[PDB]
Amino acid sequence: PYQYPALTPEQKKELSDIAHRIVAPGKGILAADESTGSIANTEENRRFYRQLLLTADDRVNPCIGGVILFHETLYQKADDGRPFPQVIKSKGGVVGIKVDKGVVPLAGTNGETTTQGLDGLSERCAQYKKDGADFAKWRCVLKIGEHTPSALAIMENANVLARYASICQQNGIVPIVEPEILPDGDHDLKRCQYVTEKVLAAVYKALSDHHIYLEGTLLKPNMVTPGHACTQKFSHEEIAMATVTALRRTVPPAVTGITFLSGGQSEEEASINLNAINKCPLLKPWALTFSYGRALQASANLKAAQEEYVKRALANSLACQGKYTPSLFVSNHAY
Amino acid sequence: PYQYPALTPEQKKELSDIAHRIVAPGKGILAADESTGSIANTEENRRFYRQLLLTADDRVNPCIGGVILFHETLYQKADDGRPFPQVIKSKGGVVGIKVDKGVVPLAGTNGETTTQGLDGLSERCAQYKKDGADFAKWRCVLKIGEHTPSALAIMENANVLARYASICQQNGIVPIVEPEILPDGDHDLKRCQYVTEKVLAAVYKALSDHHIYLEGTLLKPNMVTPGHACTQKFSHEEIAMATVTALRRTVPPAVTGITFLSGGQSEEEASINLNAINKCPLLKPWALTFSYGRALQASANLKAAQEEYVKRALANSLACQGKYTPLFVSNHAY
Amino acid sequence: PYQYPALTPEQKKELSDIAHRIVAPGKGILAADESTGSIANTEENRRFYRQLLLTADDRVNPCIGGVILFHETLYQKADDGRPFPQVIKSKGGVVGIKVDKGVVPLAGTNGETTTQGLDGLSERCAQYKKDGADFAKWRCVLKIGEHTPSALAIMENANVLARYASICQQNGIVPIVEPEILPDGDHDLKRCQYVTEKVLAAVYKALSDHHIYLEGTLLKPNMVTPGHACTQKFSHEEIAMATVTALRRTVPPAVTGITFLSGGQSEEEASINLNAINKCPLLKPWALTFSYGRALQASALKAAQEEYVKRALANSLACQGKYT
Amino acid sequence: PYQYPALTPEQKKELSDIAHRIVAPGKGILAADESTGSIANTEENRRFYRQLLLTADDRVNPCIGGVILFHETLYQKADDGRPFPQVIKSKGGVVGIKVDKGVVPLAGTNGETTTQGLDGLSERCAQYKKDGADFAKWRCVLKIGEHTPSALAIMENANVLARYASICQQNGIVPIVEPEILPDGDHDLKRCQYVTEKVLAAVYKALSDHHIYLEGTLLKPNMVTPGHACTQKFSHEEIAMATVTALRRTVPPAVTGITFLSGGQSEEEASINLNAINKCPLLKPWALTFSYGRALQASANLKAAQEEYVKRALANSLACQGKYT
């Protein structure tokens, strides 16, 4: 192996600085990047809704290190003329942009997918950087079943994530690597922990093969939870131990932060589990915070709605510090 | 591993049939798929030049089993109004379409590239199959150097080729897999053979990992030649033995045909080397024919130009049959 | 990738020549390398039974290109005073030696195994060569199940096979690569074909990765067949087509020959399937012959020898497509 | 991926506990596992040399968390008749055993090696455990050159280390994973950093593929240094930072400890660099201590030589806490 350095020290410093800004203590990410099809529905109601979240009062400023936007929102303005990226920065936030182009089927699999979006991505990134964005989001989707995720699905999704990260970093953009393992199915907590550990190991091997600068990245994994259709109830402390155990086994300390997606978890469930993860009594050498979409937005008449959002922002700000409130076989040796 | 079949029996039969039609004995491929930048320049002149090649007299019919078109040409028409895809089929040819969107650089490498174009590919393939295409081409480019091609370069290009092939086959399109090792640099014959063998082994492992149906594919490799800056001359017999040896070591017999690219070779070297390849006294369980662009078009006033092309197409139809003519030397030395 | 050549032209020619001798037209392999635990049981009875096969009448000579021996047998003598490797060679055979040291469990799997035996293997291979052997055999074992063979089991067995092949070829020994997929289970023909295809692709990627010279190797795979408890009926034609299709999709033409293991098949079944494989109307750019143990030995002094000669003769015809 | 668990909670507990004992605060490893060929020379002199080290003053007990032995020494006895493993345990140490059988050439490479010793290793581990050993060592060797370490050499050494690790853990033995990158050559600090990073990423991917329990393992890597013939000068602070950065990019936090090999460094250089490593300001979620042979033994008349070893033990005990002038 012979190095042709991907990044200069200045580019590295820029990327590490951004990543640390996003996940600073008490800060997490508003995921407002739903597509037109997802948000469903007119361009003005979309703009007004974004404006509602993005202009909530200043209690949110210390809670929100970053906001992920959809391409359209990135180019809209608030009522006062200010471009939404300027609104976010003026409140202490970093602007992010979703850059993938959705999932597509893998032939020869049981409905597994990879994600597309690499074509002309460098030129898109360079333009987004100019237009005020400093980090990006790309979502791969995996499913636990009898024979999934398959080796093909794991390899290909990890490979496309590494390509995406590489292109972003060449453009001054911090990549959020999102390998979402879906909660569908009847598998228990142990099986989710196992699959998560295998998927993340493949992701970090791929990132290394593609020469990624881990200090200028973030990870957006699922928490480790039973399948939606498992009927065994698991405690918040078990969810936290399994999640932190899987992360400790796979995620190098150099990764700057881990911004959990919420999945199907209610607003309060998502805050409680994030808090439990931060109280877990194992060494956790990275920020453990939130990148929540619906679990920050569901309770969010203009001013009432904003209060609902601020309340959840404040709650998760506390949870990502362990400060939130709403025998061998129980020890960490059982994970 | 647990199989979720990618293709039905009927889909497979369609792909294998198309693949065999393209490389039927005596037949090869005209690669007319140069982009606008490459072909350099008006659309009229581009259209006229392609009509010139596609409407040559009926003697090319038995020589050309397929033609690769650039996107714009798939939708153009000759002077009589016939769409170029109907002109090609009426002369016995299969219509192909280049689908990649060019190379891009890999960060952290010595200027190595991968190739883009997967986004929306499936929709484009279904459209092209509708407008008369039955196969496709996708080009990856590797370069030999002190530290290249790197493991990353080999892995990534083999992977994207496999993705492209999978998508095509879902849409009834035979993919031509083209992992081109450039002839640039000062490396000798043996070094080209070594790198070709390592690359193709990675290509076919990727095709297996992605569940590709090899009988419904073609391979478009470089011949094994010295680098352009190597001053040791190598004989036609040596180029043939190294090429066939590297292929025998990596390419499953299930593959229906191998359609060489010509690289920097002259029109005549390309025919001579193709012929020597077909005369090589080792077992070759696949068609060994041509997918030539410049090596069919350089020499090609309408009628004289059309005559230079016909001549080359005839020379290469003979060459892909071995019928052409204008210890250390043994196969254990390879 | 940068080459530091593993073999000289002289070394390649020696390996290619050995490999072509073993699988020359009409010839196959007698697999007589049953371990002492397997053959069960004294040393004299073992020597005598091995002598029974190796000294069979010279009508067997055009049928037998190679004989695979267990370590003990390589160092024994026939009644007439001659070392068994001398007996084999005088009948036109190449002498082969089993060099693996059995399977071991892979932790974290459902009863899956890899194979051990690499320690000291180069020194052993140099001695076996000196003592008359020109090819070797190493057996890996995979099992089709709900979650097997797993990625680990395929990768690890492909890697150990390639290590063994590398070491053999450094000592002038042709390696027979044996990735056996067991017939155990009720899976159908097509599942076996799919797994075989996936395993063989991994095998040949690994051989490439370890710089193996394929022209100086042989492959010993399972035929592609339904699982032992499968409830569906399948013709020889179908078994032949599935098998030849899997191989055409995975085995480079440079491989000199494919010497099938008989598995659980009867003497006559293995011959009929081998004949049908050779009649399959598809391009097959390698020798397709037999490396049979029980399928040559079961029905097998002069009367027993004759039954082995008859199966030798039958399989000699089958590996040419000429067996009624 | 479908799990067939390799270890029970009880097995995991035992392995984690052993691992944490070896690398507890202020503790490291005496690597006394030289083969008869390396330690070259009578059986009796070998026994006396190792006796000298193993029975040094109780002042070393807080410094030494484990001792790696060669097979021969595991079955020798001190002058008072005590098995050496009992001498080590009574001084508060964990007993280790070298179980590899040396390197072998990889054909088709530029003199690169892999390591052998897997045959019958499970049976060897179960017996060593019975005879008092609780951890093991296996050494792979890689070389930095114009075209090395090659992909084959990295993939193959990572795979054999994982096989080794799997077998040990099945037998209650904590595996020390030693992928040594040699300092030979004139490459710079960053080249060593880059290759170390690529190698460790392959090592941990392999351990994952083989279902290794990382909390029940230790890593024994080279520090990241310039090549022995490099013409550029580097400070201890730079060596520490390059080393810590390499490890942070590759080693999961679940790994219990990293016990450095001294690889050609002098007694004092190895202490200073270990101290600098422990003072590096970045987050370091594993123990960073020593697994030293010559760096603990070179200066080590019985009582005078024993004192030279005790002093190095004390120096490195401080250094693995960042507390050594």
Best interface-test mutation with D: which of A208, A217, A256 has the largest number of D CBs within 10 A?
A208
Point out the residue among D1, D198, D249 whose CB comes nearest to the CB of A254. Answer: D249
What is the spatial distance between Cα B156 and Cα B165, in angstroms, rounded to a whole number?
A: 14
3-state secondary structure B26-48: CCEEEEECCCHHHHCCCHHHHHH
Burial of B130 (0-12, 13-18, 19+ CB in 10 A): exposed
Give contacts of A147 with chain C, Cβ < 8 Å.
147
Task: Take residue B240 and report the two structure tokens written for it.
Answer: 């043939």
CA-to-CA separations, D272 to D265, D312, D325, in angstroms, rounded: 10, 12, 8
Beta carbons within 10 angstroms of residue C263's beta carbon: 18
| Residue D38 contacts residue D68 (beta carbons within 8 Å) | no
| Element of type H or E holding B320 | none
CA of residue D212 relative to chain centroid, distance: 18
Please enumerate in sequence order all residues whose Cβ is within 8 A of that of D42, keeping only pairs 6 or more positions apart, or say none: none
* A166 shares contact with chain B (CB less than 8 Å): yes
- Contact (CB<8Å) D251/A252: yes
| Residue A237 contacts residue A194 (beta carbons within 8 Å) | no
Task: Take residue C21 and report the two structure tokens written for it.
Answer: 């001798």
3-state secondary structure chain A: CCCCCCCCHHHHHHHHHHHHHHCCCCCEEEEECCCHHHHCCCHHHHHHHHHHHHCCCHHHCCCEEEEEECHHHHCCECCCCCEHHHHHHHCCCEEEEECCCCEEECCCCCCCEEECCCCCHHHHHHHHHHCCCCEEEEEEEECCCCCCCCHHHHHHHHHHHHHHHHHHHHCCCEEEEEEEECCCCCCCHHHHHHHHHHHHHHHHHHHHHCCCCHHHCEECCECCCCCCCCCCCCCHHHHHHHHHHHHHCCCCCCCCEEEEECCCCCHHHHHHHHHHHHHCCCCCCCEEEEEECHHHHCCCCHHHHHHHHHHHHHHHHHHCCCCCCCCHHHCHHHC
**Region of C287 on the Ramachandran plot (φ > 0 left; ψ -120 to 50 alpha; else beta):** beta
Q: Give residue for tokens 């092949």.
A: C165
What was the resolution (in A) of this experimentally determined structure? Answer: 1.9
| Residue D310 contacts residue D56 (beta carbons within 8 Å) | yes
- Contact (CB<8Å) A159/B156: yes
* Residues D292, D175, D58: CA angle, nearest 5 degrees: 45
Q: Give residue for tokens 């228990």.
A: A188
Q: Determine whether the annotation assigns residue A294 to a binding site.
A: yes
Point out the residue among B5, B6, B119 whose CB comes nearest to the CB of A119. Answer: B119
* A252 shares contact with chain D (CB less than 8 Å): yes
Chain C, nearest residue to B286 by Cα:
C283
What is the spatial distance between Cα C175 and Cα A292, in angstroms, rounded to a whole number?
A: 57
- Which spans in chain B are helix H? 9-22, 36-39, 43-54, 71-74, 84-90, 121-130, 151-170, 189-209, 236-248, 267-279, 294-297, 302-319
- Give the type of residue at B220: K
DSSP bridge partners of D260 = D290
* C49 shares contact with chain B (CB less than 8 Å): no
Beta carbons within 10 angstroms of residue A308's beta carbon: 16
Q: Determine whether the annotation assigns residue A266 to a binding site.
A: no
Please enumerate in sequence order all residues whose Cβ is within 8 A of that of B162, keeping only pairs 6 or more positions apart, or say none: B203, B206, B207, B209, B210, B212
| Residue A184 contacts residue A223 (beta carbons within 8 Å) | no
What is the spatial distance between Cα A335 and Cα D215, in angstroms, rounded to a whole number?
A: 11
Q: Give residue for tokens 């599942």.
A: C191
Identify the CA nearest to A251 among candidates C155, B253, D255: D255
| Residue D318 contacts residue D324 (beta carbons within 8 Å) | yes
Identify the CA nearest to C128 among candidates C75, C91, C78: C75
DSSP bridge partners of A316 = none
Point out the residue among C146, C147, C151 whose CB comes nearest to the CB of A151. Answer: C151
How distant is the Cα of B112 from the closest Cα of chain D, in angstroms? 18
Which own/partner contact pairs does D279-285 have at CB distance under 8 Å and 24+ positions apart?
D279/D240, D279/D322, D280/D240, D280/D241, D280/D243, D280/D244, D282/D244, D282/D245, D282/D248, D283/A253, D283/A285, D283/D248, D284/A253, D284/D244, D284/D247, D284/D248, D285/A253, D285/A283, D285/A285, D285/D253
What is the spatial distance between Cα A187 and Cα A226, in angstroms, rounded to a whole number?
A: 6
* D253 shares contact with chain A (CB less than 8 Å): yes
Please enumerate in sequence order all residues whose Cβ is within 8 A of that of B80, keeping only pairs 6 or more positions apart, or say none: none
Identify the CA nearest to B99 among candidates B1, B178, B37, B200: B178
Q: Give residue for tokens 């090649």.
A: B53
CA-to-CA separations, A247 to A48, A224, A284, D284, in angstroms, rounded: 38, 10, 9, 16
* D104 shares contact with chain C (CB less than 8 Å): yes
Please enumerate in sequence order all residues whose Cβ is within 8 A of that of A219, keeping only pairs 6 or more positions apart, or say none: A176, A177, A178, A200, A203, A251, A255, A257, A258, A259
* D151 shares contact with chain B (CB less than 8 Å): yes
What is the spatial distance between Cα C10 and Cα C7, in angstroms, rounded to a whole number?
A: 8
What is the spatial distance between Cα D24 and Cα D287, in angstroms, rounded to a whole number?
A: 8
What is the spatial distance between Cα B173 and Cα B68, in angstroms, rounded to a whole number?
A: 13
Best interface-test mutation with C: which of D99, D148, D163 has the largest number of C CBs within 10 A?
D163
Extract the annotated binding site of C for beta-D-fructose 1,6-bisphosphate: 262-264, 291, 294
CA of residue C22 relative to chain centroid, distance: 11
Q: Among A178, A215, A238, A267, which one carries the catalytic annotation? A: A178
Identify the CA nearest to B288 among candidates B257, B322, B315, B249: B257
Grouping H, G, I as helix, E, B as strand and the rest as coil, residue D32 is: strand
| Residue A264 contacts residue A298 (beta carbons within 8 Å) | no
Interior/surface letters B17-49, b for 16+ CB within 10 angstroms, e for the rest: ebbbbbbbebbbbbbbbbeeeebeeeeeebbeb
* C151 shares contact with chain A (CB less than 8 Å): yes
> Residue B150: which CATH number?
3.20.20.70
- Which spans in chain D are helix H? 9-22, 36-39, 43-54, 71-74, 84-90, 121-130, 151-170, 189-209, 236-250, 267-279, 294-297, 302-319
Catalytically active residues of C are 178, 220
Please give the tally of structural domains in chain B: 1
CA of residue D198 relative to chain centroid, distance: 19
- Contact (CB<8Å) A283/D284: no
Q: Give residue for tokens 């020469």.
A: A211
- Contact (CB<8Å) D146/B151: no
Extract the annotated binding site of D for beta-D-fructose 1,6-bisphosphate: 262-264, 291, 294
Handedness of CA D310, D312, D314, D317 (dihedral sign): negative
What is the spatial distance between Cα D229 and Cα D226, in angstroms, rounded to a whole number?
A: 8
Chain D, nearest residue to C103 by Cα:
D119
Grouping H, G, I as helix, E, B as strand and the rest as coil, residue C209 is: helix
CA-to-CA separations, A68 to A38, A262, D223, in angstroms, rounded: 15, 15, 40
What is the spatial distance between Cα C249 and Cα C201, in angstroms, rounded to a whole number?
A: 8
Task: Take residue B26 and report the two structure tokens written for it.
Answer: 């005596």
Is the bond preceding B149 in cis, omega lying within 30 degrees of 0? yes
Burial of A90 (0-12, 13-18, 19+ CB in 10 A): exposed
- Contact (CB<8Å) B146/D151: no
Give contacts of C195 with chain A, Cβ < 8 Å.
none
Q: Is D220 a catalytic residue?
A: yes
Please enumerate in sequence order all residues whose Cβ is within 8 A of that of C240, keeping only pairs 6 or more positions apart, or say none: C273, C276, C277, C279, C280
Identify the CA nearest to D170 among candidates D141, D212, D117, D206: D212
| Length in residues, chain A | 335
Q: Determine whether the annotation assigns residue A150 to a binding site.
A: no
- Contact (CB<8Å) B155/A108: no
What is the spatial distance between Cα A276 and Cα A268, in angstroms, rounded to a whole number?
A: 12
Structural domain boundaries enclosing C82: 1-324
Please enumerate in sequence order all residues whose Cβ is within 8 A of that of B269, keeping only pairs 6 or more positions apart, or say none: none
- What's D65's DSSP letter? E
Count each helix (H run) and each strand (E run) in chain C, helices first: 12, 10
Interior/surface letters B109-119, b for 16+ CB within 10 angstroms, e for the rest: bbebbbbbbbb
What is the spatial distance between Cα A287 and Cα A320, in angstroms, rounded to a whole number?
A: 8
- What's C222's DSSP letter? B
- Which spans in chain C are helix H? 9-22, 36-39, 43-54, 71-74, 84-90, 121-130, 151-170, 189-209, 236-248, 267-279, 294-297, 302-318
Q: Give residue for tokens 């036109």.
A: C92
* D99 shares contact with chain A (CB less than 8 Å): no
Point out the residue among B6, B107, B114 whose CB comes nearest to the CB of A108. Answer: B6
- DSSP letter string, D43-55: HHHHHHHHHHHHT
What is the spatial distance between Cα C17 and Cα C14, in angstroms, rounded to a whole number?
A: 5
Provide the experimental method for this PDB entry: X-ray
Beta carbons within 10 angstroms of residue D285's beta carbon: 19
Which own/partner contact pairs does D84-90 have at CB distance under 8 Å and 24+ positions apart?
D84/D50, D84/D51, D84/D54, D85/D131, D85/D132, D85/D133, D86/D132, D87/D54, D87/D55, D88/D54, D89/D132
What is the spatial distance between Cα C198 and Cα C250, in angstroms, rounded to a whole number?
A: 8
Backbone angles phi, psi at C33, to 5 degrees: -100, 20
| Residue C119 contacts residue D101 (beta carbons within 8 Å) | yes
- Contact (CB<8Å) A209/B166: no
| Length in residues, chain D | 325
- What's D275's DSSP letter? H
Identify the CA nearest to D225 among candidates D242, D207, D249: D242
Q: Among B178, B197, B215, B267, which one carries the catalytic annotation? A: B178
Identify the CA nearest to C60 among candidates C291, C296, C322, C298: C296
Backbone angles phi, psi at D116, to 5 degrees: -110, 165
Beta carbons within 10 angstroms of residue D79's beta carbon: 9
Q: Give residue for tokens 């510090």.
A: A321
DSSP bridge partners of D259 = D289
What is the spatial distance between Cα C36 and Cα C44, in angstroms, rounded to a whole number?
A: 12
| Residue D309 contacts residue D56 (beta carbons within 8 Å) | yes
- Contact (CB<8Å) C109/D147: no
What is the spatial distance between Cα C48 and Cα D19, in angstroms, rounded to a whole number?
A: 55
* D122 shares contact with chain C (CB less than 8 Å): yes
Point out the residue among B190, B195, B252 whose CB comes nearest to the CB of C252. Answer: B252
Point out the residue among B191, B253, B330 whose CB comes nearest to the CB of C253. Answer: B253
- What's B293's DSSP letter? S
- Contact (CB<8Å) A211/B152: yes
How distant is the Cα of B7 from the closest Cα of chain A, in angstroms? 8
Point out the residue among D146, D147, D151 whose CB comes nearest to the CB of B151. Answer: D151
* Residues C220, C197, C240: CA angle, nearest 5 degrees: 65
What is the spatial distance between Cα B157 and Cα B179, in angstroms, rounded to a whole number?
A: 8
* Residues A26, A30, A31: CA angle, nearest 5 degrees: 140
Burial of D20 (0-12, 13-18, 19+ CB in 10 A): middle
What is the spatial distance between Cα C175 and Cα C135, in angstroms, rounded to a whole number?
A: 6
Give contacts of C205 with chain D, Cβ < 8 Å.
none
What is the spatial distance between Cα B327 and Cα A138, in angstroms, rounded to a whole number?
A: 57
Beta carbons within 10 angstroms of residue B232's beta carbon: 8
| Length in residues, chain B | 334
Interior/surface letters A173-204, b for 16+ CB within 10 angstroms, e for the rest: bbbbbbbbbbbebebebebbbbbbbbbbbbbb
Best interface-test mutation with A: which of D208, D214, D241, D280 has the largest number of A CBs within 10 A?
D208
Interior/surface letters A134-145, b for 16+ CB within 10 angstroms, e for the rest: bbbbbbbbbbbb
Backbone angles phi, psi at C187, to 5 degrees: -65, 160
What is the spatial distance between Cα D234 and Cα B13, in angstroms, rounded to a whole number?
A: 66
What is the spatial distance between Cα D99 and Cα D115, in angstroms, rounded to a whole number?
A: 11
Identify the CA nearest to B3 among candidates A144, C198, C229, C234: C198
Handedness of CA B324, B328, B330, C1 (dihedral sign): negative
